[PDB]
Design a protein around this ligand. Sequence first.
Ligand code: KWN
Length: 275
Amino acid sequence: NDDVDQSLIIAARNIVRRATVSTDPLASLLEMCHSTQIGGIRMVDILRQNPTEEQAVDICKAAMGLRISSSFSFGGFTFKRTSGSSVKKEEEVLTGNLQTLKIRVHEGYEEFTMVGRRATAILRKATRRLIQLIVSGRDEQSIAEAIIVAMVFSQEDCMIKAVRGDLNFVNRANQRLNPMHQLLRHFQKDAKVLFQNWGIEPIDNVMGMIGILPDMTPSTEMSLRGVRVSKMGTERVVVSIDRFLRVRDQRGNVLLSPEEVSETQGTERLTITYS
Ligand SMILES: C[C@@H]1CC[C@H](C)[C@H](Nc2nc(-c3c[nH]c4c(F)cc(F)cc34)ncc2F)[C@H]1C(=O)O
């Protein structure tokens, strides 16, 4: 099965990337899936009978009415809300480069798990407030990637004020990214100002936990505010899909879009063919 999964992910990612530049991505994706075989089996037959939950695969599943994980993706991390709730309120904010953004601010206490390939975390937040991030990962760089995502997701003003360029990122089709993705793409390029402005704090000696400093080095004495490093680290639902491959749950939350599909290329172990 792991080898079916590997080839299915490659096929689905290639299809989503190609579809995104078409005038009608949903129609393009459906035609490509209909015409693709993996190991000589119709891709649609694999999608119906394969439990993989990767972002591109789940976009393809949604397009043909299959149930998918209720979790969402941000920065490539799968987020599962484990406690709490939030309501959205539009607010206008001013970045550190004097650009205004209209952001859907989430109001309420929430806890999430974040699962990525190289790091995992527990994130506890309230309105525009990161409370705790307990993160585990393969190295300090992988941990830093999760921290950046969590700091942007928190919607904190100090993150908004750490922006140092204009935000005009677009997708493959030259469509402007939404504000949360604008902020994320900015800080993925360079997080030094974000990390230097976030704040540090002293930590207590807790077995299995350590701090991480703005320079991404470990410390037993201090850490980025709210952040601790640990050595320790889903229901399927009906979703909707639209022309531009935005996948929403029944309550309208945007679980997936092409912006959350990895750019990683790979070489399939089962032949992918196209008729
Ligand atoms: C990816 C887009 C940007 C961020 C994520 C991916 C959005 N999707 C969802 N966000 C939430 C959510 C809960 N609490 C939040 C918070 F405190 C801050 C925040 F930014 C989002 C949330 N819950 C379910 C979702 F499906 C997508 C969008 O809305 O465009």
